[PDB]
Write a protein that binds this ligand. Structure first.
Ligand code: CL
Ligand code: NA
Length: 129
């Protein structure tokens, strides 16, 4: 599924991401835009052989199992394919674990380079929430 901007904002809000660990809704929408272009089916492979999955591009090296990343962990205890569903529940619940692990949203490279320190409120402007 390819979400619309306001559609994804409303979905994320319903799943408890607004101000989660102090990060306003606009931060999450901005990260999803630049990680996956709002596409739940996005995949990208990394140099070390791990793969990133879904709307928030969660990495198989640490967070999910894809059966082909040797010596990796599975800290969200899910198959990586569950992160590609049109229902974003699994992606959101895993993201909550990631953002709580001490490094906040700096875990997402696109957020650090393209969202951090910008006016992220603009990403939810005009949406009915
Ligand atoms: Cl933080
Ligand atoms: Na893994």
């Amino acid at each position: 599924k390819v979400f619309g901007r306001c559609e994804l904002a409303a979905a994320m809000k319903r799943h408890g991401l607004d101000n989660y660990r102090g990060y306003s809704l606009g931060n999450w929408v901005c990260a999803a835009k630049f990680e996956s272009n709002f596409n739940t089916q996005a995949t990208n492979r990394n140099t070390d052989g791990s793969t990133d999955y879904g709307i928030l591009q969660i990495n198989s090296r640490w967070w999910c199992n894809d059966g082909r990343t040797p010596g990796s962990r599975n800290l969200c205890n899910i198959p990586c394919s569950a992160l590609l569903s049109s229902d974003i529940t699994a992606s959101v619940n895993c993201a909550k674990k990631i953002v709580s692990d001490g490094n906040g949203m700096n875990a997402w490279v696109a957020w650090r380079n393209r969202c951090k320190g910008t006016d992220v409120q603009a990403w939810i402007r005009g949406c009915r929430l």
